[PDB]
Amino acid sequence: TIKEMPQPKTFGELKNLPLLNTDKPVQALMKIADELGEIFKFEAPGRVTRYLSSQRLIKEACDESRFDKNLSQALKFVRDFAGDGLFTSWTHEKNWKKAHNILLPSFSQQAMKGYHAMMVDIAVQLVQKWERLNADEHIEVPEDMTRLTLDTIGLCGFNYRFNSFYRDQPHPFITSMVRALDEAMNKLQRANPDDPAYDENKRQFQEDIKVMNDLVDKIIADRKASGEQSDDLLTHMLNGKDPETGEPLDDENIRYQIITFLAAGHEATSGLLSFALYFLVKNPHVLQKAAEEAARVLVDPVPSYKQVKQLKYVGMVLNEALRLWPTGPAFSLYAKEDTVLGGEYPLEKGDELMVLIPQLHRDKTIWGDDVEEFRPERFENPSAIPQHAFKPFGNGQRACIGQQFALHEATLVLGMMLKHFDFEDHTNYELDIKETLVLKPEGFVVKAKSKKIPLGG
């Protein structure tokens, strides 16, 4: 029966804003959820949102006939450069539905067979970089994983090589995109957006859009000119027609999808690999068990697709890192119609909800009371996890289109890492989670000792 929604203390016209004075708002909101429970309202001047934390309420939120994906303010600023790509489109936009129908078969578990060789290509480069470090040296984990995922997505996405392992300063495209992403995030905390002190920012953001558009438009035009087929997504987008309308994507939209895959894919996948390595080095017994499987399964100089599929425990490791620290930590929904949530909380059409995924993943009625512990064995039998309890890829038709890709990629790379090196948390690293569009273990570093096992040929 109808309840008032909990809300943290408001401070006059500042409302709840003083409780979020932080560059780590997700982490700050988990602490409010621990105080207030499965649902709370959070008010800033001019904005209201509800934060959901329990599997019980999230399962309702995930009903697509009642709620649909909302573009949060972050996603609307990212739309300045990612346009109506899949990630920053409303569900009702014709290009959302066209791209979705055209691209889905290109992201399935089956489609992974055709990307695997390109993924091995960048994965071998990463292993060789680490084999070639001298004794005195260490690895900057998120930085190398970001080099890996950007290059993998560039190769599989549109057969372009950013050659990140050949560079101290990334390819201009990558500098621009990271900077554009950075600016989108900085605009959120921007008190007075139109003050002249942000004129250089605006100009730089415009310059970064042109850089990104120019490269991608040039590669699209070059592939149409050359007319040749690759195993890449760009080939699928140029030949693909929506079975609903029978129409292909236009060139501009194809550009946006390409910028989208890179922008949406690379940082979350990078974060996942970094957190996985974090948890392994902090849990040596889990590390040994994963390394044992890697040694037993990956008996070839390079992994085949079928071998990657056999790495069950590595898969469990990844899921358990996603349970604790899902690298896209929140997603936003609006009420399609007036509705009552959980039998107690009335909502009007348009009202916004945010799913706080790390807090969902600590629901003790689902996971047990030990929710903070890293235990991959939670995932030994995935069919036994209750529906909507584990949501690191979002929900329904607006769920992560890259989920198979990200998992295949992380499994492959992690298995290769576990196979070829021993690791040492030589600084006793204290976890520091930076928040942007995604989560990542900032400043995470390790030493790898090579097991001297020969590689790909």
Annotated binding residues for (9Z)-hexadecenoate, written as ranges, equal 51
Total Cβ atoms within 10 A of residue 264? 25
CA 281 to chain centre: 22
Rounded Cα–Cα distance for residues 33 and 54 (Å) = 10
Query: Of 261 and 421, which has the nearer Cβ to ligand HEM?
Result: 261
Q: How near is the Cβ of 148 to ligand HEM at its closest, in Å?
A: 12
Determine how β-strand 330-335 pairs with β-strand 439-441: unpaired
Q: How near is the Cβ of 65 to ligand HEM at its closest, in Å?
A: 17
Residue list for the binding site for heme = 400
Q: 3-state DSSP: the chain helix, strand, coil percent, rounded to 5?
A: 55, 10, 35
Query: Of 326 and 358, which has the nearer Cβ to ligand HEM?
Result: 326
Structure token digits, residue 316: 């469990």
Rounded Cα–Cα distance for residues 304 and 116 (Å) = 8
List contacts with ligand HEM (CB under 6 A): 69, 86-87, 100, 153, 260-261, 264-265, 268-269, 272, 326-328, 331, 392-394, 398, 400-402, 405-406
Q: How near is the Cβ of 149 to ligand HEM at its closest, in Å?
A: 7
Residues near 175 by beta carbon (within 8 Å), at least 6 away in sequence: 169
Q: How near is the Cβ of 324 to ligand HEM at its closest, in Å?
A: 12
Q: Single out the residue of 367, 363, 390 nearest to residue 378, CA to CA.
A: 367
Structure token digits, residue 168: 């101290």
Structure token digits, residue 406: 């990200």
Distances (CA, A) of 171 to 174, 345, 347: 5, 50, 47
H or E segment to which residue 189 belongs: none
Query: Of 8 and 329, which has the nearer Cβ to ligand HEM?
Result: 329
Q: How near is the Cβ of 451 to ligand HEM at its closest, in Å?
A: 27
Q: Single out the residue of 430, 351, 357, 426 nearest to residue 389, CA to CA.
A: 357
Structure token digits, residue 187: 């605009």
Q: How near is the Cβ of 401 to ligand HEM at its closest, in Å?
A: 4
Q: How near is the Cβ of 139 to ligand HEM at its closest, in Å?
A: 20
